[PDB]
Structure 1
Amino acid sequence: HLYPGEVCPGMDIRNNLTRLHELENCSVIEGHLQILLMFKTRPEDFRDLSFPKLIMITDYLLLFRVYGLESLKDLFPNLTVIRGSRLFFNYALVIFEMVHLKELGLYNLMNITRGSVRIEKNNELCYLATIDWSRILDSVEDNYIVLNKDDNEECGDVCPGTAKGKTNCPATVQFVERCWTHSHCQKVCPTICKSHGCTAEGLCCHKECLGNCSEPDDPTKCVACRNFYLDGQCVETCPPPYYHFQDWRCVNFSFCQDLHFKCRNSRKPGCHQYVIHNNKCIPECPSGYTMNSSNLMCTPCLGPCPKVCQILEGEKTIDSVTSAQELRGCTVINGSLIINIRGGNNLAAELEANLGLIEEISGFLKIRRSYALVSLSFFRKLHLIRGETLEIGNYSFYALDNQNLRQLWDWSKHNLTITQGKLFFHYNPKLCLSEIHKMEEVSGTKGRQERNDIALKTNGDQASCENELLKFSFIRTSFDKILLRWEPYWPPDFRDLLGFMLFYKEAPYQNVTEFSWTVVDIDPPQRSHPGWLMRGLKPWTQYAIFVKTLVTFSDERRTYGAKSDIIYVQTDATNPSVPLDPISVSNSSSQIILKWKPPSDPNGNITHYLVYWERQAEDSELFELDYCLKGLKLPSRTDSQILKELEESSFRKTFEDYLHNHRPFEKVVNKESLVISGLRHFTGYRIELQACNQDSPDERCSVAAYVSARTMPEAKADDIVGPVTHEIFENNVVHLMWQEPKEPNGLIVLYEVSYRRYGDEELHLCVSRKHFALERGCRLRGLSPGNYSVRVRATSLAGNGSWTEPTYFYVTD
């Protein structure tokens, strides 16, 4: 009970009605259900077509271009729950381009567990606005219902009750009625039970039901199982000895074992070798687990445990990265590989990531027209070619037309065995016979090769596999250039030497292993050690250099030549560049902070920065000029864009390439910020800054980077000190005496005197330095007699000072 019919897998019914009858009996579909591409079907064919026993769908339901179908109210009257275990592009119910479809009709669809619904391009579909997706879908924000007949209002969606007062089922959110068809309306359960379902009477179903039930509060009288199905009863979890299967039912070990048995051999494509783990008949053991053949349990494995991967007919071509991504992690391959990589970006390392775990090949390994492969080192773990599946001619290794192949494997550090078959190397220009013969010795295939199987005149050709050695003799360098010499190597026939070849590159790290390389060709010595003089090298840089000879293949035995070992030579250090971006900021009367960044060209390691600061005296004209004369200034010291960008950058770069060849100072060590102490208040300071990479042994380093700053002035340094003495002689001639602010902010440009008789107005008058020095102050004249007031303010470079306390004087009448 609880599922009267059988269970069917998914199907892709198409182009004919002769396959829809496969749902004659089964009540649950363990997969998806696609009915699409129905061109010849007529509406008369669906009148007598129904599957009333269908209740449950695991993955999704899809409909696309079924001509003649009008509604699903007859197709799946009892379709209740769509789990959405596997979604069609995040959609659990797709109705796409269903011409002639008028209404959905799935009135028994209470719940869609996972996914959303995509209904689009349905120019005849009505009854879409009168459906409650919020009561069916947990989250409706992922829905997609557009381009239907309900987009432009043309549907008369009328469902029972409207003539009687929209009765026979309620409405909710506008409070529009929720209903499926013109004769069947949606059944909505009360909120007292979330999703357990309820009968038509109103009493809720059991917690283990889903949507509908025949008897309230009964796990054996439901219609769908919320968690799992067993013996006609919905259970919270599968009890032993039954395991969870497909996240919707419980089955015994026998069923999972038997399904795995059919998946072993008697099903070629796409079957799942179901395994038991966590009491679940999982299709495949998760990562870090292996299958124990005794009971199919996913027993944990220590370290990298085998991941056997099968191949379509045991022959897979790998012509790019995408084909290699499929074989990720496959320790053992039960098949054969075809490598036809004609190019790629950043290969032999990402390719190593994809294919570096293969330890076994059941068939043969093939490399064919692989233009971009320089070495087979990406087969980091390959150790045994079984040679069970072989090509025509019984070939296990088949290398052909490999233009850039230079080595197969580092035989000094690698092992490989081939059980059956013979090798084949043809048209491998950059790979010489030494590597092939070494592989023949290593793999034990020496006694299997016959005539023409190995090409003796198309392989070891343009290959650089010199057997002898070149020893460098004289190497001593400079800051910009490096001198190199080596022993003069001569082949047995001195006419055979075409010259030498020198390779170098910038190698900050010594992890250089040949296969960027700047190449220099050198004529042979005139029968005097040959060498080259490098010229454009950056100072303080590590260069990897090796020398390879260039000989000619003689008609007699080939002279391989000699190549030097890869040596690392470091250029000398020189004067560093200007320390870029020097900024000085004043935050105190005696403290200024100096900030800078390391130079763009250290030309070594910056041992210490050298800083010079020199006091700048104030301008001479500030001492003998009257600043209250008519006309005065107060000395108050403190693709269009691309074309400009490239021109300005080139302008900056032009000057940057030009510069390449007793005062208080200090040495800043390993710091790029500095603050100076013991500075006079409000004084412009000239700062000369230098980066330096050597201190004691005849120091030589960069040119000065100049910047200037002025310290902050004291608030009360400009205040007038001493009494404001007044004096007259006879005729109301005021003679104001006052002491200077001996320590001003820079200097005192001028003085101003404000005087006002008792109750009268105030008049302003300046005092200049020349006037002040000659007059020892000021001499007022031409003012009325009586009692007055005197206020004095001192003006410095920082600004106007504080007015002195008012002083009064009374003159003789």
Structure 2
Amino acid sequence: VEVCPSLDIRSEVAELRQLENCSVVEGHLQILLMFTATGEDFRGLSFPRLTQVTDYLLLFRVYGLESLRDLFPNLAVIRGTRLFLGYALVIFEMPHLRDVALPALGAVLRGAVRVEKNQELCHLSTIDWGLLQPAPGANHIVGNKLGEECADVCPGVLGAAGEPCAKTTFSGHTDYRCWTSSHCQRVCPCPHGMACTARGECCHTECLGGCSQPEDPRACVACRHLYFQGACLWACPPGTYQYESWRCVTAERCASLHSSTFGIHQGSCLAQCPSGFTRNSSSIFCHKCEGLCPKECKVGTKTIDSIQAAQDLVGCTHVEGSLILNLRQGYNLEPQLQHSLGLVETITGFLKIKHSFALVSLGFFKNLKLIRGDAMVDGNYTLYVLDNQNLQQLGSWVAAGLTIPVGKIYFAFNPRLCLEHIYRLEEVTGTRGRQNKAEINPRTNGDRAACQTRTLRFVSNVTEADRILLRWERYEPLEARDLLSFIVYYKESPFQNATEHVQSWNLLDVELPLSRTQEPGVTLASLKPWTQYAVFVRAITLTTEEDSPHQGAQSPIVYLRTLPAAPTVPQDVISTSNSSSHLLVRWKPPTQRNGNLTYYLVLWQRLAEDGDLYLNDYCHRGLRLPTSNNDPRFEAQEASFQKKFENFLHNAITIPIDFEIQEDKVPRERAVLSGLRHFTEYRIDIHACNHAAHTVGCSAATFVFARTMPHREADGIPGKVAWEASSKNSVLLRWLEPPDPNGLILKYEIKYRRLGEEATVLCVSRLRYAKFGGVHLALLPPGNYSARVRATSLAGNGSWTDSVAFYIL
């Protein structure tokens, strides 16, 4: 019945009293921030006549509210046309709340239900939103009281208050459905979407929530689809039109309800027609737009100071007022402004542009056509461009596109706006005799900048490893004085796309020589080898004469490439041995390729064992034997030291040409070395390479030391150990040295023992063995003895050999 628009209530229980004359809310109902409220105030407060909310219901921090069983005892239908971030029912941070208690709630047509952060509210898990919501899968009910902490008691089940009611399943829990401990959900047997009554018989289909009589559209308490004159209908009668997607009102009635921009397109009296539809003065029909929507925006004198300030005028076509641009802190604002401004076609007031240090061009007014100037600046000025430090192009809204009915233009203190553009604008405007001098006079605008940009062509280029010399043709300063100097912009551009005038570039001044020959030239230095550089030049040609054509000149962006140099040393060289005659090497590409990497030059050299291990006794002073490589591969002073030695290595180059260095070339970053000796150390040099036949050469070495795996039977003693007895209790035992041991042999451990007793061992060094060709045994009891021999090499212990038996008498 009553319109009752969307309303918000805060801070006062008395403020709640604006719902006495309310029946259905044509919006959203918000109740929030109730600090000075107790249970006594809410116990005696009720709104029984409220029965429908259109948009959504929000409750937030309403102190002292125990339950909603008294506030909304008849709230049946929540339309949910407009959603609070997708939620039609929000109950957030509500102390003293215990149960939702909406016994008369029939359905929620659209929207999710969010009930979060109510540490005292429970009695929620005992209800199903399936009968209420069409999709109760979007509900977000977390943070409340623990479900098992409170007993979700419905009037049935146990010895509760009284008569029970129906039970339903929501998420596999076929349990009783109850709102509170006294009132439970009204569930009646009939197909979905049909309100019922006290008798239980479900009413007419168009009914929603409840009804007074069965099978009667006029008896509905809330029309499901459309409402009109106490009747429920699928669509409005032909004499009416839809409103708020929930009621029917005549064209005049809905026109009065919105009392200029409202429209009734497609059977719906909306506040504004959507894109492509508009109306001006005819009957209230949103007809199709021709090619665009002529949106009209009204501002008195809108001052623009940034992109956001101009974002208000987006989509505007006819501006009813004046514009005052002032953009000093921005940068590259042309695209953003063109996004915001540029659909404007007519400006009723003046246009002014002051102190726009960031406005390179006025090209964001492409569709600007008319400046009527009904309201104009003091002194009778319509276009007022003043103090623009760098404004060159002035845009393309010229050549009969413009017309200015009344007022004069005023260009002052625009140094980089040469007078040809302003004179062209005056010519195409059609008003020339309206103004006078001192308004477009020179000495303030038109100097400095150029009008006709000439072209300077590079004559000579020389490229070095870290230096580029350029020479362009000499450009005479036309006018005699015309003090000029060139400025070269050079930057590092990996690709062949670059933009002029814009920082990223490197600027370098060059004064031209005073002669006819020896063109200006320039020598860029400190450039990385094999790097593409974008270079161009520009003439400054600043002059002070009154009437003179500036005619600045510049050059196209040209891309040059420096000569390649030797690359850096390979990094992280890892060597391993998976066999007794093979080596595997891996590494990483150099940190500075300095060209196109082609391959890696790998050299390996066999290293002879040091003479230290040869001539000395090893029966005493044992050492830690070397092990084969098994690497798993499947502060300021120190830094200065490494930096100095890196600078030393920077000048190191390599010409790609028991001790014999063997070389190979490997395309990938991994190498396999074969044909190596067993248990012999090798030094590996790895140099990254590129096109070095004509270049300085390959990189420097990154040598590592790798030892191959020992052989299993390289220590085996050839032949059989021989014996020679003597009459003086001594015996000589002779055995031949192994032919190819693991590097070298160290000692001989001979095991001898008399038959029956324990075993004895003896260590003999190489010199002692070679002195007599074997070992001597003396001062032993007579009898039959047995002896065994074994060789020991750098790899480790050898293999025992066949025993020899001798006799002593």
TM-score (norm 2): 0.73
Q: Secondary structure of the residue that 1:809 maps to in structure 2?
A: strand
How far, CA to CA, are the matches of 2:762 and 2:316 in structure 1? 100
- The separation in 2 between residues aligned to 1:724 and 1:42, in whole angstroms, is 112
Structure 1 window deviating more from structure 2 (99-108 vs 573-582): it is 99-108
Specify the alignment match of 2:800 in structure 1.
804
Please state how far the C-alpha of 1:809 moved relative to its aligned partner: 2.4
SS of match in other structure, 1:811: strand
Match of 1:764 among 752, 761, 782: 761
- The answer for the alignment partner of 2:744 in structure 1 is 747
**Following TM superposition, by how much is the alpha carbon of 1:513 offset from its aligned partner in structure 2, in angstroms?**
2.0
C-alpha deviations, 1:138-182, integer Å up to 9, x for none? 566455669xxx9xx9x9x99999998444568999x9996559x
Output the aligned Cα RMSD.
5.9
Alignment partner, residue 550 of structure 2 = 560
Match of 1:515 in 2: 502
Match of 2:604 in 1: 613
Does the C-alpha gap of structure 1 residues 718 and 105 become closer, same or farther in structure 2, counting only changes over 3 Å?
A: same
Distance 1:778 1:611 in 2: 47
User: Does the alignment pair 1:729 with 2:717?
Assistant: no
Q: 1:760 to 1:43 in 2, by over 3 A?
A: closer
In structure 2, the partner of 1:392 is: 376
Kindly state the Cα deviation for residue 787 of structure 1 after the two structures are TM-superposed. 5.8
Matched, 1:128 2:121: yes
Residue from 590, 606, 620 that aligns with 1:629: 620
Which string of whole-angstrom CA distances, capped at 9 and with x for unpartnered residues, describes residues 321-379 of structure 1?
A: 54566778x5967778765444357x4487379559x55544387655443343456x4
Separation (CA, whole Å) in 2 of partners of 1:69 and 1:733: 116
Q: How does 1:76-475 map to 2 (within 5 A)?
A: 76-82=72-78, 84=80, 86-88=82-84, 92-93=88-89, 106-109=102-105, 114-117=111-114, 128-130=121-123, 135-136=128-129, 141-143=140-142, 165-167=160-162, 185-187=183-185, 189=187, 266-267=260-261, 306=292, 311=297, 313=299, 319-322=305-308, 330=315, 339-344=325-330, 347-348=332-333, 351=336, 354-355=339-340, 358=342, 361-363=345-347, 367-375=353-361, 379=364, 382-387=366-371, 392=376, 399-409=385-395, 417-420=401-404, 425-437=411-423, 450-451=435-436, 454=440, 456-463=442-449, 467-475=453-461
d(CA) in 1 for partners of 2:260, 2:244: 25
Q: What is the distance in 1 between the residues matched to 2:609 and 2:216?
A: 102
Query: Any conservation in 2 of the 1:501–1:547 contact (CA below 8 Å)?
Result: yes
Structure 2: distance between partners of 1:595 and 1:660? 23
1:541-577 CA-partner distances (Å, limit 9, x unpaired): 3333333344443243245254331342525324234
> Secondary structure, in 3 states, of the residue corresponding to 1:588?
strand
Cα deviations across residues 32-51 of structure 1 (Å, max 9, x unaligned)? 12356899999999999865
Q: Is the counterpart of residue 525 in structure 1 residue 513 in structure 2?
A: yes
Checking the alignment, whether the CA contact within 8 Å between 2:6 and 2:26 is kept in structure 1 is yes
Contact 2:9 2:32 in 1 (8 A): yes
State the AA in 1 paired with 2:595.
G
TM-superposed CA distance for 1:708, in Å, is 1.3
Partner residue of 2:132? none
Gaps of 5+ in 2: 130-135, 168-172, 630-634, 652-659
After TM superposition, the score normalised by the length of structure 1 is 0.73
Displacement, 1:675?
Answer: 2.8
**8 Å Cα contact 2:482-2:541 kept in structure 1:** yes
- Match of 1:578? 568
- Partner SS state of residue 573, structure 1: coil
Distance (Å, rounded) in 1 between the aligned partners of 2:248 and 2:643: 76
Is it true that 1:704 corresponds to 2:700 in the alignment? yes
Between stretches 396-405 and 577-586, larger displacement belongs to: 396-405
Q: Which amino acid aligns with 1:603?
A: N
Q: 1:798 to 1:43 in 2, by over 3 A?
A: closer
- Does the 8 Å CA contact 1:401/1:426 hold for their aligned counterparts? yes
| Residue number in structure 1 paired with 2:712 | 716
Q: CA shift at 1:770, angstroms?
A: 3.0
Q: Does 1:684 align with 2:681?
A: yes
Indicate conservation of the 8 Å contact 1:470/1:565, yes or no.
yes
Q: Check the 8 A contact 1:505/1:518 in 2, yes or no.
A: yes
CA distance in 2, matches of 1:42, 1:586: 81
Q: 1:129 to 1:477 in 2, by over 3 A?
A: closer
Question: What is the rounded CA distance, in whole Å, between the counterparts of 2:248 and 2:190 in structure 1?
Answer: 33
Letter of the 1:511 counterpart: A
Aligned CA distance change for structure 1 residues 736 and 525 (closer, same or farther; 3 Å): same
Shift of 1:21: 5.9
Over 3 Å counting, the alpha-carbon distance change for 1:35 and 1:510 in structure 2 is: closer
Cα distance in 2 for residues equivalent to 1:647 and 1:327? 63
Q: Which amino acid aligns with 2:596?
A: N
Matched-pair contact (CA < 8 Å) for 1:472–1:564: no
Q: Secondary structure at the match of 1:705?
A: coil
Q: How big is the shift at 1:634?
A: 2.5
Partner of 1:641: none
- 1:793/1:200 Cα in 2 relative to 1: closer, same or farther (>3 Å)? farther
CA contact (8 A) 1:478 1:572 kept: yes
C-alpha displacement of 1:727: 1.2
1:597 and 2:583 correspond:
no
Match of 2:483 among 461, 483, 497: 497
SS of match in other structure, 2:767: helix
Question: One-letter code of the match for 1:525?
Answer: P
Partner of 1:476: 462
SS of the residue 2:723 aligns to = coil
Q: Which amino acid aligns with 2:56?
A: Y
Structure 1 residue runs of 5 or longer lacking an equivalent are: 639-643
Cα distance in 2 for residues equivalent to 1:430 and 1:8 = 61
Counterpart secondary structure, 2:724: coil
Check whether the contact 2:317–2:345 (CA below 8 A) recurs between aligned residues. yes
**1:672, 1:415 → 2: CA distance?**
65
Distance 1:310 1:678 in 2: 88
1:202-238 alpha-carbon deviations (Å, 9 max, x no partner): 8889999877677899999876788x55789999x99
Asked whether the 8 Å contact 2:98–2:123 carries over to 1, the reply is no
Q: Is the 8 A contact 1:466 1:562 kept in 2?
A: yes
CA distance in 1, matches of 2:577, 2:716: 25
Asked if the contact 1:15/1:37 (under 8 Å) is kept, the reply is: yes
Letter paired with 2:750: V
Q: Distance between the aligned counterparts of 2:232 and 2:786, measured in 1? A: 107
CA contact (8 A) 1:636 1:799 kept: no
**Identity of counterpart residues, as a percentage?**
39
TM-aligned CA deviation for residue 266 of structure 1: 0.8
What secondary structure sits across from 1:402 in the alignment? coil
